[PDB]
Amino acid sequence: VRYSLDPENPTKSCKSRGSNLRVHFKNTRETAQAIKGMHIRKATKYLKDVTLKKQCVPFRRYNGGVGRCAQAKQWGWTQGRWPKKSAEFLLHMLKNAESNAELKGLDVDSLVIEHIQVNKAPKMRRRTYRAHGRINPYMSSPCHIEMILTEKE
Amino acid sequence: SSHKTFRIKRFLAKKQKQNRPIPQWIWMKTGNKIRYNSKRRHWRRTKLGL
Amino acid sequence: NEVVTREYTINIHKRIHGVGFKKRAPRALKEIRKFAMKEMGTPDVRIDTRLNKAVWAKGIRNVPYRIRVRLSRKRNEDEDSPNKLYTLVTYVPVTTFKNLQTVNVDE
Amino acid sequence: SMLRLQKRLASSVLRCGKKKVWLDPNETNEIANANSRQQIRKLIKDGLIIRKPVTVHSRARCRKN
RNA sequence: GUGCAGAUCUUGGUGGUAGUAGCAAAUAUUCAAACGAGAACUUUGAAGGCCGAAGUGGAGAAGGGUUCCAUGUGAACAGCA
RNA sequence: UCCGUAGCGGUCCUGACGUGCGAAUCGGUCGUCCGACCUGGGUAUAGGGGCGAAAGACUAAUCGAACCAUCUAGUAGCUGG
Ligand SMILES: [Mg+2]
Ligand SMILES: [Mg+2]
Ligand SMILES: [Mg+2]
Ligand SMILES: [Mg+2]
Ligand SMILES: [Mg+2]
Ligand SMILES: [Mg+2]
Ligand SMILES: [Mg+2]
Ligand SMILES: [Mg+2]
Ligand SMILES: [Mg+2]
Ligand SMILES: [Mg+2]
Ligand SMILES: [Mg+2]
Ligand SMILES: [Mg+2]
Ligand SMILES: [Mg+2]
Ligand SMILES: [Mg+2]
Ligand SMILES: [Mg+2]
Ligand SMILES: [Mg+2]
Ligand SMILES: [Mg+2]
Ligand SMILES: [Mg+2]
Ligand SMILES: [Mg+2]
Ligand SMILES: [Mg+2]
């Protein structure tokens, strides 16, 4: 599958991919920007802390009306949330990348998430009912998620 | 209603029999374009006239 | 040392003060479960059905003010969880809540 | 599991409501494969389905009045 | 039937708003267990409640047409699951 | 005939709502409630016509002339390209 970014060392790099994932794209982008510079153990621990509301995802671009928490000050930001479903989906995908690395025989504890990006999947359609006999869209915003690990010691 | 007539019940019988999905083996055919049954009907959505 | 049971009394009347009428008995259950988590360091807290009867004995808006509660920390059974020990929380019927200390009962 | 069917058939056999039907909570899997009126009459005989008594509406207070 | 920037142009697609407005009419849920990969919402039991015989009960007419019943699934729908 | 329930209706708050539960609803307060009462089904009256205890009201969310198709690509000294 044609990836967006090629790895600098494909022997020591593994890939994972997911398409048409029923997650909010904006929450997925902000948490992937949080994951993007991390080692795999730190990323797994921080994604568990997001679901347990111990560490937050800073909302940097899509932050309109997003409330302010105390835990965002570790990121140099004021607005943060804890997207649970979005943290679990790219934890399942991170486990898939773990399983793909173990298949290639790469070292488990040296994996650093080198590339990750979130794209917009095709939007799927439902319908809501408004006043004065008007019917409005109830569109979902699913996402494609892409990541590449790299042995970085 | 439960007080049907014979012609109405027979019309309902035919419209019951046309409301089944396509068989699985028809889209292994050579000159085939049908993906699914597009003439399907649900009792809540489309109210069949009458 | 790890498997220990002892009896406390819980003042629901100070753990309850301020919440509305339709949430007083569920808030009393959550406060009993929170007290059990704080006093026995296990996140797995199981409350007895008789204790649920005792809290909900009057109704949803008049919870009993004090209640006598036996905590029993026990080893977890099969399907080994991240929790290693759990806390069984038991009603103890009593007449008066006068001069009842924290009593360390023994098996 | 799911005992929606068993309570309905037990109510119909006992000629009471579903309000009064008591299924055994310990023997759930043995009631869960009954799926018939004839095999549910057996479990009523065996005591795994019990018709609960009527909730008490005492008349003694207004008799006293 | 030959060149578009406009005609509250036509059709189709996509943005900011915006992860915002909102998911607030009719008193209310709680504990334990089972099935399961997964349980605030399924099932069972124990409670606490409501409808309170002009009922949130039991049956019909009109209308609907398989929605009835059994089993399986959890892709899409059932505005959380 | 009076108070008043079910039913029928809709005064006031010019309350709620007003991208609403709703293209007319909801709450309290109200009018009437044995008669010019309420209501189902059947049937009759059709558009310059019906029907009207009469408001130009109603006649399928359409009424000082309903709706559908055609004449019709009606005409415009007027507006926009
Ligand atoms: Mg911004
Ligand atoms: Mg704003
Ligand atoms: Mg709406
Ligand atoms: Mg409408
Ligand atoms: Mg309908
Ligand atoms: Mg030409
Ligand atoms: Mg153009
Ligand atoms: Mg909001
Ligand atoms: Mg019935
Ligand atoms: Mg009924
Ligand atoms: Mg849903
Ligand atoms: Mg009179
Ligand atoms: Mg009168
Ligand atoms: Mg007003
Ligand atoms: Mg408003
Ligand atoms: Mg509503
Ligand atoms: Mg005439
Ligand atoms: Mg009149
Ligand atoms: Mg006039
Ligand atoms: Mg002129």
Single out the residue of A1, A3, A25 nearest to residue A148, CA to CA: A3
Chains that touch B (3 or more CB pairs under 8 A): none
Return the exposure string of D18-55: e unless at least 16 CB atoms fall within 10 Å of the residue's CB, then b.
eeebebeeeeeeebeebeeeeebbebeeeebbeeeeee
Whole-angstrom Cα distance, residue C10 to residue C16? 11
Residue nearest to nucleotide E28 (CA to C1'): C22
Length of chain B: 50
Token look-up 């679990």 returns A88
Long-range pairs for D23-31 at CB < 8 Å and ≥24 separation?
D23/D48, D23/D49, D24/D48, D24/D49, D28/D1, D28/D3, D29/D1, D31/D3, D31/D6
Other C-beta atoms lying within 10 Å of the C-beta of residue A135? 9
Residue type, D60: A
Q: Give the C-alpha distances (Å, rounded to integers) separating A43 from A52, A54, A104, A150, D20.
A: 14, 13, 21, 14, 54
Chains that touch D (3 or more CB pairs under 8 A): none
- Element housing D41 (H / E): helix D37-46
**HSE-up of B38 (CA within 13 Å, CB side)?**
3
Q: State the SS3 of chain D.
A: CCCHHHHHHHHHHHCCCCCCEEECCCCHHHHCCCCCHHHHHHHHHHCCEEECCCCCCCCHHHHHC
Cβ pair A49, A91 in contact under 8 A? no
Q: Is the CB of A132 under 7 A from strand F?
A: yes
User: Helical H runs in chain C?
Assistant: 12-15, 24-39, 49-55
Single out the residue of C91, C61, C87 nearest to residue C72, CA to CA: C87
Residue type, A152: K
Which residues are within 5 Å of ligand 3 (an ion), measured at CB? Answer: A 129
CA of D1 to C1' of E42 (A): 8
Interstrand relation of A127-129 and A111-120 (parallel, antiparallel or unpaired): unpaired
Return the exposure string of A51-87: e unless at least 16 CB atoms fall within 10 Å of the residue's CB, then b.
eeeebbbbbbeebeebeebebbeebebebbbbbeebb
What nucleotide is nearest B9 when CA is compared to C1'? E65
Interstrand relation of A135-137 and A127-129 (parallel, antiparallel or unpaired): antiparallel
Token code pair at residue C33? 């479960």
- Element housing D40 (H / E): helix D37-46
Whole-angstrom Cα distance, residue B13 to residue B20? 13
What nucleotide is nearest A129 when CA is compared to C1'? E79
Single out the residue of A95, A86, A101, A128 nearest to residue A11, CA to CA: A101
Whole-angstrom Cα distance, residue A80 to residue A70? 8
Q: State the SS3 of A65-111.
A: CCCECHHHHHCCCCEEECCHHHHHHHHHHHHHHHHHHHHHCCCHHHE
What nucleotide is nearest A128 when CA is compared to C1'? E79
Q: Which nucleotides of F are covered by protein (CB under 7 A)?
A: 18-23, 61
Cβ pair A72, A112 in contact under 8 A? no
Query: Pseudo-torsion of CA A115, A118, A121, A124, nearest 10°?
Result: 150
Cβ pair A114, A150 in contact under 8 A? yes
Cβ pair C36, C46 in contact under 8 A? no
Token code pair at residue C101? 């200390």
Chains that touch A (3 or more CB pairs under 8 A): none
Task: Give distance in angstroms: CA of B3 to centre of ligand 13.
Answer: 44
Cβ pair A63, A75 in contact under 8 A? no
Task: Give distance in angstroms: CA of D17 to centre of ligand 10.
Answer: 16
